[PDB]
Symmetry: D3
């Protein structure tokens, strides 16, 4: 059903859209895949129309205004006319615990990720809520 | 662009769905309205299939697993086949700064609320991102 | 799998929207619920942009132009991008024979009602056409 | 709208009216929006109803029968596309009860061919801001 | 279900929409039918806004710019917000091999046809790709 | 006008999905983009459920049964519940005149390409039918 070739293609598509991020700390990308369709592609950045597109606060920390690639993928799916329920998620980085909570409640059956985010606990949050997790 | 009777009807519906929450600390409800349609009703609580519906810990603080009413309304809209963009939101309590971030990115033009959340900074966040706010 | 707590909330929402009616004889409200979503909310009244709000003529009777709550919810569903088929209907009052007829042809599986309308034949029409009926 | 498609939509209405099992009169209604026939309704008894007949022993129409416009309207609620800003092709001009709902549904125009016994329904349409054309 | 009476009606509708064609060689109509709805109706003709209405050149052959009734039906379904998957296709003439290829890949379960087109290979192609074919 | 880096991201996504193709002569990919969403991704190949996925005959030429990347993108949009009308197309190669015919009728307002396909007349067909063409 989901061959190693297409599964690689979706993950590489995630890596492409992470490069669109203006982020200095980490460039993150998220892809929502359902029935051979990419319904959303999210990357980390400040809100639409924000006074700056810089993700960092001058103290070295990420601005609390910036949205995570997963949040942007969820928000897009809410603005979309297609359901996120039953879809799969291709992330460049494992989602944070706050995001993993929403991803599970959204009805995403499986999360694919390539790299580990500094907070690993999101993986456990996903599996504890009945979401499959595969590192590739 | 809304008759006061209709405005009150939506707020009372938010208050009606907040009461189904199992939360002890505060019971919160949220209603997504677009073109005379309640596209989503969300209340605060633990995720679906979670081991319990109790929202607080042994020490009496809220469980980090519980989703907010606004989060649940946001997630429901991602499961929905209708767009949250251009809609209005009716909340029993003013959204937190974290939710307000997603609400503004979702394209919600106005947020109606009745009671104030401890962290009142969310109202400021919403207004700073071009979302009208009204207490009623 | 409707639970009593949540089922009462839908009926009380129907009662909330019935109060929006300008009708003097009887205030009626109808709620379309499918998959934990309120797809339509209808109440009795004159058509949109009619010369008057008043539902009754200067004689005792109801203006033949006014739409029943069930009619308004039905029409609303025709304007909706969601299907009424498989949904449940929460009504403050039992639907009239003319409405009951359309409700069954719409594919509504169950109608909930609280009060009995003067003509109680609609209950039979519903049950004869294979629509479950519960009073609450 | 080009005259030739206008006639094609009306002939479609006339084609679906014939599927009716009605003895008194066979009526067909077509919902058209952006080159698409979203609903095609005809007069008949409800689904699952014990009979196909559309009339009683007096030979009056059975109150259980749905009008062609009603079936078209109901189908639009069962579907996932909006009737709002659509046009309606009818073999016979809609009755006042159906015209009420047609107008509220946001149908902008009604095309009709024959006149139904009660002519008052056309007047209802125009009062509620719905364009009417006989063809 | 697809009874003889209604099946005839769908075929005659395809015959009605073929007469709209400005073609002189042959007038062809195709309609897409799913769950009692005619989602598309296509006839053969030049593209929208093409310099001429004439479907044939000066040599006697059809202009290569002319879209087949099946193509236009397919193209319409792409502009539509409804899915062609699982639908049935009523055609005045049996589709050509080129169209039959796309029709099968679209997920059309059955194609009905009345008259046979010059190149009858379309029928074979259609069956070889798992699409039912019935002449009426 | 869309940002240059996302424009490159779409083109590279077309290049990613062209690699999934099992074709030896040339690997082609097509991407449908509307309002920051990839509604379709198509590549050249044999139909679904075909005996093989080799797209060439012993004659070293291409099997007439194979679908072009743009055909697969078009068909996918018909199977979809979203509209192709007003979208932009990202292609690894310039479409053939047969596909360009359908692309213009679908309402695609712009075609982006990287490489030139041997028959260069497809660009002419697109431009003659009011479709913007840009090489990148
Ligand atoms: N296709 C898109 C478009 C936007 N965004 C997110 C990333 C930034 O957080 C914000 C940027 O908004 P914009 O590009 O409209 O200025 O929106 C996204 O994830 N995917
Ligand atoms: N219409 C609904 C249904 C559910 N929930 C939320 C409330 C709980 O936090 C979580 C669990 O609900 P359930 O018991 O239906 O699985 O889903 C919601 O916000 N709105
Ligand atoms: N959300 C709505 C809006 C309107 N109506 C119906 C009730 C009256 O019959 C009429 C009122 O029209 P308007 O809202 O334009 O004043 O429409 C309804 O049932 N539900
Ligand atoms: N495409 C359809 C199918 C059915 N009906 C209506 C006409 C009759 O009132 C009833 C017939 O019952 P059934 O759907 O079982 O054929 O349904 C309709 O208007 N349009
Ligand atoms: N409902 C429609 C509308 C249009 N067309 C096709 C017929 C012509 O080939 C092309 C051009 O039509 P027009 O000149 O009206 O834009 O559109 C079609 O098949 N079905
Ligand atoms: N997302 C997809 C899925 C399939 N195909 C096309 C490529 C081949 O021509 C055929 C392969 O089908 P499948 O992989 O289901 O066997 O369908 C495509 O272009 N894009
Ligand atoms: O789930 C996540 C977690 C982090 N990110 C992004 C957001 C931040 O700009 C970068 C930097 O991570 P930080 O939280 O600053 O360590 O990570 C994300 O996009 N999605
Ligand atoms: O914006 C908000 C903030 C809190 N809630 C719910 C979440 C918690 O269960 C109760 C109380 O939160 P607390 O942060 O514990 O005060 O509020 C909410 O639903 N929406
Ligand atoms: O099925 C029904 C029956 C009555 N109503 C409403 C419409 C009228 O304004 C009130 C008054 O009842 P009546 O007795 O029909 O005049 O009832 C309704 O909304 N739906
Ligand atoms: O507006 C109308 C009027 C009548 N019909 C059908 C209803 C009946 O079956 C036939 C005969 O109408 P009658 O009301 O019996 O004259 O017309 C209809 O479908 N739409
Ligand atoms: O599958 C098909 C095959 C032919 N046609 C139509 C299109 C052309 O205008 C006519 C003439 O075809 P010809 O090949 O010239 O016989 O056939 C079609 O619409 N769909
Ligand atoms: O416009 C085109 C032309 C060819 N392709 C595919 C078709 C074939 O599989 C390869 C090779 O083309 P050919 O026509 O075989 O040279 O290109 C395509 O997808 N789109
Ligand atoms: Zn996160
Ligand atoms: Zn919150
Ligand atoms: Zn009624
Ligand atoms: Zn009628
Ligand atoms: Zn053809
Ligand atoms: Zn091609």
């Amino acid at each position: 059903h989901m061959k190693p070739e297409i599964k690689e293609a979706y993950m590489k598509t995630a890596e492409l859209f992470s490069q669109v991020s203006n982020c200095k700390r980490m460039k993150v990308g998220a892809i929502v895949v359902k029935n051979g369709s990419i319904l959303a592609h999210g990357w980390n950045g400040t809100p639409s129309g924000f006074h700056t597109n810089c993700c960092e606060l001058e103290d070295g920390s990420t601005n609390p205004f910036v949205l995570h690639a997963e949040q942007n993928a969820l928000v897009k799916m809410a603005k979309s006319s297609e359901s996120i329920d039953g879809s799969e998620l291709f992330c460049t980085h494992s989602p944070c615990p706050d995001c993993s909570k929403m991803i599970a409640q959204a009805g995403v059956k499986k999360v694919y990720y390539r790299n580990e985010y500094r907070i690993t606990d999101g993986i456990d949050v996903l599996q504890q809520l009945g979401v499959e997790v595969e590192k590739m």
